[PDB]
Structures are given as structure tokens and as C-alpha cells.
Design a binder for this molecule. Sequence first.
Ligand code: 1U0
Ligand code: 1U0
Ligand code: CA
Ligand code: CA
Ligand code: NA
Ligand code: NA
Lengths: 620, 620
Amino acid sequence: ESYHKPDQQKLQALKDTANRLRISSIQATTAAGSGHPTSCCSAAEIMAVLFFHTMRYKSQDPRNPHNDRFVLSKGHAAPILYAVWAEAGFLAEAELLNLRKISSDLDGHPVPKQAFTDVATGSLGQGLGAACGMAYTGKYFDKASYRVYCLLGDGELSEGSVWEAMAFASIYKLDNLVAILDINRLGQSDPAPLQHQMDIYQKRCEAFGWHAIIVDGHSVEELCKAFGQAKHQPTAIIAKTFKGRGITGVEDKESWHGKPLPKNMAEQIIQEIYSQIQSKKKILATPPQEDAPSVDIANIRMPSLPSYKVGDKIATRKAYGQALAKLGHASDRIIALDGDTKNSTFSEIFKKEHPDRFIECYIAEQNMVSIAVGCATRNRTVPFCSTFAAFFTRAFDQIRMAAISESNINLCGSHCGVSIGEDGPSQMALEDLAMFRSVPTSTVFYPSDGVATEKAVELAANTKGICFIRTSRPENAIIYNNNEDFQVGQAKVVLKSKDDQVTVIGAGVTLHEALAAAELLKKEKINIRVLDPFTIKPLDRKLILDSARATKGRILTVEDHYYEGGIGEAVSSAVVGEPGITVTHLAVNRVPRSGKPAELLKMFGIDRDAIAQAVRGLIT
Amino acid sequence: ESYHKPDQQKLQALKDTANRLRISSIQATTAAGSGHPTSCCSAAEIMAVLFFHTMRYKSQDPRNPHNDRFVLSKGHAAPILYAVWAEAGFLAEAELLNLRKISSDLDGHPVPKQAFTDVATGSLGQGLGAACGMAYTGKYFDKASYRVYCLLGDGELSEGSVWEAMAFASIYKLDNLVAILDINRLGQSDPAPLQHQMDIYQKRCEAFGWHAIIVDGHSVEELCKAFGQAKHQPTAIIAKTFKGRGITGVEDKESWHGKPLPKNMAEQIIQEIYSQIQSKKKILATPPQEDAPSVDIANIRMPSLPSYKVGDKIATRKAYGQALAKLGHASDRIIALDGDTKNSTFSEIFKKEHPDRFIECYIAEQNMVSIAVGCATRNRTVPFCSTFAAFFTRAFDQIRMAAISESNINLCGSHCGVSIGEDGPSQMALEDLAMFRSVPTSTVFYPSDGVATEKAVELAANTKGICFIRTSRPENAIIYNNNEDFQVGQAKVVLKSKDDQVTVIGAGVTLHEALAAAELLKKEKINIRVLDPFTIKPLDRKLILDSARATKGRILTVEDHYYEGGIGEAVSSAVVGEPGITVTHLAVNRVPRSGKPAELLKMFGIDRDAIAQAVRGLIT
Ligand SMILES: Cc1ncc(Cc2c([C@H](O)CO)sc(CCOP(=O)(O)OP(=O)(O)O)c2C)c(N)n1
Ligand SMILES: Cc1ncc(Cc2c([C@H](O)CO)sc(CCOP(=O)(O)OP(=O)(O)O)c2C)c(N)n1
Ligand SMILES: [Ca+2]
Ligand SMILES: [Ca+2]
Ligand code: NA
Ligand code: NA
């Protein structure tokens, strides 16, 4: 469609709209007693032009799949986001004054309980990554006409994650993506490093492969024109603005970030801004081209049961790749992402079978998680991202925000624990159980064999929230029948007798070490019950306690993870106070080192001999 | 100090050295059966020229404070780092063959148990930030002549944290820092995005303010010359190389990352490389200018006791800023770092009193932690970095690697929990105790008032490892006398009696809500013991159990944190199986929302009324 070059009356209406947005931002933050009106005011023309000239969307159906997407990366400007959606007619105007109240959903930073918000923002530097996932989806998966617009602050651009997204967008030719940089010179507590050196912002964007246009960010005409031209590259509109634009005495001043105007001042300033507004008549939003395809919502099932064989040896990292590739034959919704580790995580198998649905994210875990979050918005895809579990610590804030965003993403982290051997601790995940258990919408799968891994992949695909699958490097035996039934929150007793002395809880390599310990102990006429949790979160407290009650109330938990936040603390928290129950915990007590896998399990006290000694100790 | 322009015999010796380094990297990785010889071989001329032409260091004293610093950011090239230290005469040549053995300290990636290693690397993209800390220290604190050199991979440059470091270096004019980029075209599992588009690497480095020089990375002469000119800017040596350089048939080939040569192949290739070496005579290292100052190692003590009075009200975040500024008057080694949040964390108090020792890191938490790690190397400074606790999740991998680096850094995270109120969950730390408790060298301080905060700052300054101080936004009353003695691992019973029915454990805001609950329960003739842990890690289990035994074995924990990995799980894990002890937990069960602080404590079940109700329920 052709650009509609606005006339002076449309330009004036956009100016009027921007000033209404300023007034509302001040009124709401003054009513709340907190917030960021100066951060809203530098963006007012940008917001007016995007919502009332450039973008195409259904004002009464913000989540419509055909709509252009807007991502407010500088989330603290939430009051102006609320104001535009009131201006567009979706949000009642009076509700704007209930900003930050416990009786309102117009919270401090945007959240998806708001229909007009796809991803929660408020941790700076993450919105552009989500926007890149939306734009990739639009161009390559939905193959639709919608565009994606993301507004960033200039302080925000100090976050490395933004530059990961900038590079992603140029690698993948996201010519449907626009980043608007609100270059208002000041951060929270000092000027932003580059201040108003517009040329350096242009050079950085261009060096990263973007088409970069410097504009007066308070000129509705310049904004209409810059947004009005599509490009063959991702486009950066580098807008020179002033913080607190339009607030006399505050515009371009320090010491005003996150400071509301006191009532008396707000009244004077609003009268001043209102005096500039020529008409009360509001501009109407313009709707989109309806060319986004239908998407299936049904549960996704593996095309057949697992085809392993009991006794065969396979590492759960390889079983994950096999299983993910298999699931991709069952549904076109499954997509896979990996950070230059596909040959190690075995996500390469999925890339070989379904290349159109694999996204190489390179060595940039923060962005990879944000891409996945963006791809999962509006349920357009079911993403599985993978790397070594250790490197998901690099993306903890993106995972944290993903839960705040009520996102449904799946993450598979390999190479857990000391059992990887010789690479040493930089590559060993020893805190990932602690990390993912602390994510409030998480489900944590720790499959112990190839069958359980395939079942975990299938279950995760159909489970809402942040699903984590912990895979392993050692080649352990298949212990489960292919037709064993698996469920979230259901553990398995893999070894039992009537005279069991202790219930030993292990997972991945430590389950197999526990089974080996059981054989050692049998020689000593000592039987142990062995339990595989399957999911660490939620934990099968009932089976754990029923097992303990059959083994003199004694539990021993053994894990290839640090002591804090892992399996043993999960078990202790579940059963503390239960009459006659005792818990012994074996875990890794300090930063490891290099050696062979079996050597390290011995050094760190979680191998078959350490388990057997613990058991012999306990019976006394 | 003048450049020594090498003669052809020196150049030939540098080539011979590079080829010896190649041979050793192959021998060691073939002996180990794992490792990254192709990643070593692209860097061999770079390593030869740095260690045997450019750098100034004491070969028998790698930690000497006057030495130039070298950071191997692409840590998986460890075997060539080990080779250069053998070439320099510090390491025995035979030990190189023990790479990755449990009997050796020549681990898979570099670690500070090696005298020649300052910071552990292995998680890509972090070395440059550590190097920036070293360089900032050298120019501004030590005010010494040493230079800092950091070798990066090209896939590694996809990490946003690298760009944060690049921007830091140019803001702070680190004209004593050199980044060497090993542009060998290939990542782990595919070509790096830019491959050999050298001009784009130059453009990106220049846009970020570096002097950028493109060289042939296999030309010892071009490397000598590029390293031999000092600049007024941080300098990037953009070296065009080939992965596996010198390994016939493997050079510039995919499918060889992290793959050792089989024995038969190693023997053939080593014979060919050896045929290229003209002399067995080794180059000697050259010592440095000894102008680094003496630094004092003594215990650091506050110049006076805290000057708070019982009953006064102060937020622990403000007490932190006051305490930090006070300690800075006590010791010259204290430095403060903050990520554009100084007005919120109150690190601005330190900046005002000791501006030369404050480092503004901008909105870039991952780099901030790496800067601190670098500043703490060789014990040159005692850093305290601060931001909101939620945003330390952005730096979890840097914190993880800091522990692998045996680093002594101090972290203060403010704005914990729902008690911050209206900003909402993006700003709320609810997983920070889980996170830091999983860091194996950590000490976790959770001060409940101003006095405890000042004592925590003092103790942290003198405590090794990763110290975390969790501060709070509500103003709560001072409950401790100024002369109260505090120690790591020692809790305090702040309310007790002979007829206590429950031991309630709270911290920060929830300690105060517990005291309020006790006044409430007094109406009901019900007495409760209240315990302040002070440190969450390590926990005073003795005092907690002694308390529980005086209160019918009953413990209730209440915390402004998620359930997993926090205070309640620490306590449960500590007492599980103790006869007669029960533990009940109150925490935050899901992603919160905006409201007034008191309304959120109420909504999420961790206020005085929730505590009292829980107590009543235990008594029945
Ligand atoms: C990763 C991360 N680190 C720190 C913060 C705290 C913070 C903010 C809170 O959302 C509201 O004050 S706003 C803010 C300053 C943002 O400055 P800019 O990006 O220049 O935006 P603005 O000038 O348009 O407000 C910080 C440092 C953050 N939100 N995220
Ligand atoms: C944050 C982070 N993400 C992923 C990895 C795994 C990894 C490595 C292991 O240390 C050794 O294989 S090396 C590696 C490839 C590095 O490629 P480059 O930076 O181009 O270096 P190189 O070509 O010089 O080897 C990856 C993806 C990593 N170490 N760190
Ligand atoms: Ca700004
Ligand atoms: Ca490379
Ligand atoms: Na899922
Ligand atoms: Na310390």
C-alpha cells in the first residue's frame, strides 16, 4: 500500500494526540505518586505517529494475529502505552488514573494480563529480541504482512542483549522490523554515554547492518515520513528527543527520572500543554491486511512410541535430538533454536530433518531466549531452545522475564554436572536446578534414559510455562520399557525389594550410579530401593514418602549439582517434619575441575562407591 | 619503551615458536583424547608474538604486579596458553602432556589455580570485561605502565557482553588495552556470521570507539608492528586467520571444532610442522617496568560503630550507601561500581565522598560484574558492585564464572521482593537467594535493619568469595543497639520468652512483619520467638535448632522471595530428620503485580496477619 502523505490538519491532529498522551502520562503518575512521566514525554510524538498514522491493527482486538506488533522495550514508559490504547478506544479513559493500583491491571511496567501486551518488559534491553522473534515469525513462518515496531531508550542500548538482537535482525534480513531509538540524552542517574552524538548512534547501527535514519523525534512530519518508507533491511529510526519534552522547567534536565510531578505542578503544566492542543477530535486506528494463517491448537503427540531397547546405551543429550526431530514430523508448530552448540546438544538432528524450522542463534544465549519468547507469542509456534545448561545462566534475566510474560517456551540444557569430564567447570551445569526451580511457572524434567527423554520432550511440548529438560553426556543404559507411561509429577521406583534398607533418589548419571551401588551392596546382603523422580518440579512427594515408609523412613538423595536449590533440598523441603523420616544428601560441594567422568564422580562424592558408603553408614 | 623492530632472525624465531606451540597443542590434546587443537592453531602466531616480542613479564613470577596482563577469552585454546608458559620456562614441558588429567592442574579451560591465570574463562564473551577491569585498574588506580592484552574468538563476538566491554573501554579511554580478534571464520558448528568480511569487523570496532587494525594473523611481522604502536584509544587487532592453521587438510575446514587428531594423524602432522622449524633455540621473555605500587592487605575496619538509634527508621538500601561511604574512609582499596542505579541503591553516597573510586558502569550488569572481577585480581582492590537484586540475574553467568575464578567480589542488590510496591515484578528480586545460594563460594547477607547492614558491609569487605548483600526499599525501624556484635553464620534471637510456641524466622521486611505479628498474638496471649538469620548462607543451624527445641519443635519461615531456593528451603534442608522438629513455610507463590508495599505483602501471604494465622494453625 502507498504512503498516505499527511496534510497539515492530520499533522496537527498527531501533535494534538502527542500532547494528550503527555497530559495523560502526567495525570496518571501524579495520581499514583510514582512513575516516569519524563520518560513518557520524550516518546510522545513517536507514539502518536506509530499508533495513529503508521501502524495497522484492530483497536478492539489487540491480540489479533493480523496486527502489526509494537514492543515497548523501555517498559517504564508504560503510562504512555496505556494512554495510546485509551486514545485508540480500547481502554476506558478513566482507568488511566488507576495506574499502579492493586485494583487495576495498569501495572508499573507492561504485562500480558493486558490484551495489548504480548511480552512483559521492565528489565531493559530485552524487547528488541522479542521483537526479532515476532518479525522472524512474520516473515518466515506466518509469511504475513504485519510489521514489528520496537521502542528503546538510549541508556537501554548499553545492554549487550540489544546488540545481539541488532546482529540477529541483519543476519536474518528482518526487513519487516523497525527499531525506534528514543535518544533523549539522559539515563536514570546521569547522561547516557553518547548523549546527543547522533552520528555515533548512526555509525553503530549501520555497522550492525541496519538502515539508519536520524530524525527530529518531536517532528510528527519527519516521523511519518521515516516510518512511511519500507526498506530491504531492518530499519533504525534514531530519534533526537528531549527527556521531559513539553514540561517547562523539566525538559532536558537531570534529577527527574522516575520522579512524578507534584499535584500543584502537574496542574500548571497540564494547563500549558492543553493550551497547545487545537482539537479534541481523535484520530482513528486503521486495520490490517488479514493474511496471517490459521494455527492449530491441538495437543501434539509423538508419531509412535519410543523405539529404544532396554540395555542399549545412549546419552540423554542424543535422545533429546532424536526425540525433538521425531516430534517435528508430528507437528509443524515445533521450532528449534540453538546457540552454536547443535552438534553437542544434538539439535542438529532436527536441523537436518526440518531445516526451515531451525533457527541458528549463534553464541548469544540471552537473545536466543528472547527470540523464542517472541516466536511463542500469540501461540504462533512451540519453541525448543538448546545449549549447554551452564550457559542458560547467561540468560537467567530473560528466563525470569519470560515467566513474567506468561510465556510457553521449552529449554533443553545439556552437559549437566561433573559427569561431562574433561572440559571442566566452565562447561558444567551445577546450579541449573536451583535456577529453573526458582522460576515460578517452571516444570523441570530430568530424564534418566533415552525413553524418559523422549517422553519428557512430548510432555514439555504440551505443558504451559517455562519447561526445562536437563540432559547429560554419559551413555547410560536404557532401563525403561518403550511403553512405560510417564507423567509430570510422577516418579518411578526402578528397584525395590521387601527388605530395602534405604530409598536412594538419583537422576541422570546418579540414578545409574545408584543402580550400580545396589549391585555392590547386594554382595553385603543390603538391599536398597532406587527412585527416579522424572520431574524435579513438581516432585512426587507421595511416592517418595511411600517409598521411605517402606525403607525404615530413610532417604538418601544423590545429585550431580550443587547442594543448594537442587534435588536434595527439594526432597528435604517436601518431607521435613514427617514422623520417622530422615534425609541424607550427597551433592557437589565446590567448584570442580577436569578429569574423566568417573574420576570426578568419585572426587565429588556422588559415585557408586560414595553411595554405598553412605548407605552402610546410615544403617548404623 | 621504544618499539624494537625485529630482524628476520627474530621473525624466524617467532615463526618457529608459533610452530612449536602448534605441535604442543596437538600433542597435548591427542594425549588427552579431547580438546581444541584447531582453535589453538589459528592463534599460534598471535601467541608467539605477544609472549616473545610484545609483552613484558617475569617468566618465573606470572602473578607479579608489574607484569603485562594476558586474558585468554577464548578459553578452550587453553593448551596453547599452557604451551607458551612452558616455552617461557615456567612450566615443565613434560607436564603439557597431562592436559585434562585429574592429576594435573592443566585443566580443560584456564583457572586461577594456575599461577599464570588471573580469571577463569570458558564461558565465552567474558574475558574482555575482566581485561577492562585490569586496564582501568592499571591506568586509574595502580597508575602503572603495564598493558592488558585479551584474545577473543570471532564466534565469541556474538556475545553482547563483549560489546558492553567494548563500549566501556572507549568511554573510559583504556589506551593501555588491546583486544586481539582471532578471525578464523568458523564457530563450533558452522561459520561465524561475518566469516572473513574483515571490513565489517573493522566498522563495528570503530563505531564503538576503538582504533581498529586489520592484519594477516599468520604474519609475525605484521603482528609485531601492530602491537608495537601505543594509541590514545583501546586498540583492536583484527586478525585474519584460518582455523586449524598449519594442519594440512584440516585448515579452514568445518567439522573440526573440539576434535583432537587421532594418534596416527598427529604423528604425521607433527612431522610436517617440525620440518618447518629452523632452530630449536627459544626466545626469552623480557621483564617489565616495576612501577605498580604497594597495596595494603590488612583487615578493614569501620572508623566507628554504626550511629543509628533504636527506633529510628531507615531502609537498608540507604544504610548500605551510608556504610559503603563510611568504609571508603577506612580503606583506600574499596571501590564502588553501579549500573545507572546509584540514586536507587544509594551507592551515590560513596560517589559523592570518593568519586575517584566510583565506576559508573551504565545499564550493563554483565560487564559490571566482569569489571569487578578484573579489579579484584591480584588483590588490587576490594570492589562493591550494586544494582537492583533482580538485575543480578542478568549477570548470573558472570557471577558463576567469578566463583570458578576464585574471585573476591562484593555484590549488593537492592529492591528485593514484593515490598518495593508499585514498580511491579520486573523490578522485584524473588529468586536472588536461590541464585546466590547456588554460587559455591558465596556468603549471603540479608540485613534486617541499618545496624545489621553496616555490619554486613564490614564483614563482607573482609570475607573471601562471592559476597551478596540483599537490601530493601521499606523504611523499617532500627532494632539492634549500635554495639551489637555480628558474625557470618551467627543469627540473632530478637524476641523470646519462656512460653514461646513457635520460632518464626524472618528477614528484612518479613522480620518486621514477624515482630508486628508477635505484638498481635500477644493480644491472644500467644508468644512467639523471632529469629533474624543475618546470613542465609551459611545458616546458624545451631541457634535455629536450639530455638525450635524451646518452642515445641516448631519453626515457621516467612520470606519475600519465591519458595524454591530461599530461606524456607535452606532451613528445611538444615533441620530435616531432627526428632520433633517441624517447619512451615510462607513465601511468594507466583509472579506478583503492582500495588502498595503493604498490599502486596498481604496479597502474597507474608505480612503480619498471614504470620499470625499460620502461628495459630500450628498451635492447633
Ligand atoms: C536490566 C535493567 N537494569 C536497570 C533497570 C532500572 C532502570 C529503570 C526502571 O525500569 C524504572 O526506573 S529505567 C532506567 C533508565 C532507562 O534509561 P533509558 O533507557 O535512557 O530510558 P528513558 O530515558 O527513556 O527513561 C533504569 C536504569 C532496569 N529496568 N533494567
Ligand atoms: C557462553 C558460551 N556458550 C557456548 C559455549 C560452548 C563453546 C565452546 C566450548 O568452550 C569449548 O568447545 S567453544 C565454542 C565456539 C567458539 O568459537 P569462536 O569464538 O569462533 O572460537 P575459535 O574458532 O577460535 O575456537 C562454543 C560455542 C561456550 N563456551 N560459552
Ligand atoms: Ca534516555
Ligand atoms: Ca572462530
Ligand atoms: Na511447554
Ligand atoms: Na568480600
